[PDB]
Design a protein around this ligand. Sequence first.
Ligand SMILES: Nc1nc2c(ncn2[C@@H]2O[C@@H]3COP(=O)(O)O[C@H]4[C@@H](O)[C@H](n5cnc6c(N)ncnc65)O[C@@H]4COP(=O)(O)O[C@H]3[C@H]2O)c(=O)[nH]1
Lengths: 187, 187
Amino acid sequence: GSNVADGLAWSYYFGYLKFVLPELEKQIEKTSKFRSKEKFVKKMFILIPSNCFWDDKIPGSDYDPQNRITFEGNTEPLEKTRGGVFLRHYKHSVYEIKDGENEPWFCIMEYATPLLTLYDMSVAQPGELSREERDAQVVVFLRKLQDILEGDRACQGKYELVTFSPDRDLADVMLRKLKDSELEIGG
Amino acid sequence: GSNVADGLAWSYYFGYLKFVLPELEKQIEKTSKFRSKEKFVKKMFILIPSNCFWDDKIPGSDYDPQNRITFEGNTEPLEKTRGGVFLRHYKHSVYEIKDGENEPWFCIMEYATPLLTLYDMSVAQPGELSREERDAQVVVFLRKLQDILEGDRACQGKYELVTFSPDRDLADVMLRKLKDSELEIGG
Ligand SMILES: Nc1nc2c(ncn2[C@@H]2O[C@@H]3COP(=O)(O)O[C@H]4[C@@H](O)[C@H](n5cnc6c(N)ncnc65)O[C@@H]4COP(=O)(O)O[C@H]3[C@H]2O)c(=O)[nH]1
């Protein structure tokens, strides 16, 4: 078949999210600065740009036109062993998002790395994956990943999928989502 | 769909094989011992056990009942940047395979790591992937990976796919494949 996104969503889960999402809050809390910080939503915000593409660095990128996103630091790495072929250490980037004159938020943001395969495929093998087929596979990927994560009780409340057009301001998008998150002061 | 193997094969290529296979021989040649060694076939032997499962360490495992396989060392790591979400260093394991009283072979062997996802899926989500459906997906994975690698001229002659039942002796299998490889003395 040509439905690559199904396999991409399942391996993204079993090769990564299944074991980092339940532990993310605990990993974050290993750092005193992160324990001390309020307005630090502890969910992984998984970024899904509709064009499967991004600038390697989020702060100041085309998705951050107002330069309101700042890299703060990394979480304490988690150790995980599977198959012994190659070793795996997992860590995440914490960002600060300005909220006007108020206290800025901290959050975890990461592009959905399987989108790289959709992008690479559309550029190197256009006969296998047209631009339009890639657009559709992003949606398949999104809906399958949703089904997978919603079926795992250990992942509940630990992530948020963020879909956006490359024309949108990620700082504005994230700010709205952070304000809408369940986390309250002292939570 | 439920055809996860297609996506597994494509991301295995774009996320890994596409850039390690063309460079493998050159990476190997960075180590004097490996330059000096004869009977060192430079292809990556990609191991595809039909049950999608393996002991983390190949030497002395259930696939090596005669203990003829020995870990020799790792290749010099390759640097590759993609997406900036997480950093990537790639290296491979070199093994010695005994050939009776003759000079033993050196080779590169690696289990096909996407099989871990097929296995994990069959165990954690049997309703999604039955044992019998998993068996079939291994074959789909194999044939799709074959199509992908054979379509890339830069990968030609750089790999060999090795399929086998868990009852077979991997040392015996590898020995025949090494002898059948194109490499000649001084090559
Ligand atoms: N033997 C070997 N196999 C590798 C290596 N790197 C990747 N692979 C294999 O290709 C598959 C796709 O790699 P990807 O990096 O493009 O997608 C990755 C990546 O999109 C995501 N992921 C894994 N670790 C991540 C991380 N630390 N950060 C962000 N995303 C991550 O999970 C996906 C699937 O991981 P995986 O281990 O199950 O499958 C790999 C794996 O089977 C490697 O270095 N050695």
